[PDB]
Amino acid sequence: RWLPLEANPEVTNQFLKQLGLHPNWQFVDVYGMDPELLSMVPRPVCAVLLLFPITEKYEVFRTEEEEKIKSQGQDVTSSVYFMKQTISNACGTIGLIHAIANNKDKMHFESGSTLKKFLEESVSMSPEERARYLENYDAIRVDLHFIALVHVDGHLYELDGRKPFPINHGETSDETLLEDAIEVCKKFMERDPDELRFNAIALSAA
Template sequence: MAESGGWHTIESDAGVFTYLIESLGVQGVQFEELIALEADYLKQLSPVYGVIFLFKYQMGKNRSEAPMDGRHDMDAPNHMFFANQTIQNACATQAILSVLLNADKEQVDIGDSLREFKEFTNGFPSDLRGETLSNSDLIRDVHNSFSRSSPFVDEGTRQATEEDDLYHFIAYTPVNGVLYEIDGLQPAPIAHGSCTQDEFCDKVIPVIHRRIDRYPPSEIRFNLMAVVQDLRVKAVEIGDEEMLAREEQKRNDWETENELRRHNFVGFIHELLKGVIKEKIKGGTYDEWIKQTKDLNLQKAIAARKGEPVD
């Protein structure tokens, strides 16, 4: 896999993902973070088009090995969108598109831009599809517009090593009556047995549980995001005004958070800290302030070692 090629990392965040796909022209779809890994909980969000799973990636694994669960479907339908990941930092958007570009067109409106992209790459081998995705100015620019502003060196400018904590996004979605795991680092989609759209919630949860169980019990750094119908549309359909108000407020909060991501506050914080220090020195309380801060940090460190709550 090549280096970043101008792709930046983005957060696994429902607001980021929702506004990202809307910027690409997708209509009537949003993301919801799952706080419980239960089929009944997932069903409450129906219709569910797929899920995006974030996990710590184990470096050095041979991508041609047989999967530990399921099987590589080398004969997956030609019209199915599967692209190899050919560049770093693109896996979040690639996983998202793996759900959307395989969704039933009667259920999901992916918009003109993604529809043209899907039609253009139809019939391409998976590696060429990945190269085409990586070189799409539109998709890359929209993806990068949701990365955090940083004054420091972009991690994407260097090749990852086995010492890094790396995280990877993959997708699970039903296609043509089969539950597929779509991972751009694999040679083909991974089939997990028969699965209709109505069965998806019941069948995907055990698969994810089995994957998590392969990690040590101490590993808790996982994130699962459901790709669902815009919940504002659902609220209107069932006439739930309270739900509609909550979803509208959620959208407002997401918009604010996304706007903040685009700003670099290091300069502001630096000037603020300079002002605080200036006032402490002027008032003759600087040394006492530093001592109190050190004592407080020491107390927190001791409490943390003992497993005690830290205020």
């Protein structure tokens, strides 16, 4: 049912088509975080999806991050569309939904778009309700984990349905989203320095 758990621009772009999106935005590989490989990515970029592995090492950081934000708070704009995860194999599809939901006004939906209908129906549901609706909503059908990195109201949000909330990673813009999101990706990698299994795709203007 779900997007397979591999960073694969062409399968993702095919699924976008089938969800009712015109191809004015298309996913591309991000070949590395190096400037030489980063500068290859078509711009504007309105979302980065990161595929990474959920390790013990990852998990201790995640719990610390949750505890630190519960103590010290963070800002999450009400514009942010967040959805909880209830099935782990759904994480790629959830990442795609986060990327598109938080850029809905950049997208060109076909009239009968199944994703368009899911988004307009789910505009006022809770993150938890949205996961339940997604489980029911048959039409969205085609260790490793996806997150989405998007720019909303001047800040970079990591959207991971495993977490209680979006994570505010600081300021960013339409223009610098690719760089600012890859900074966050490199922070993921730094935390798990022996782990090879990090692959990103960028939702680029086409």
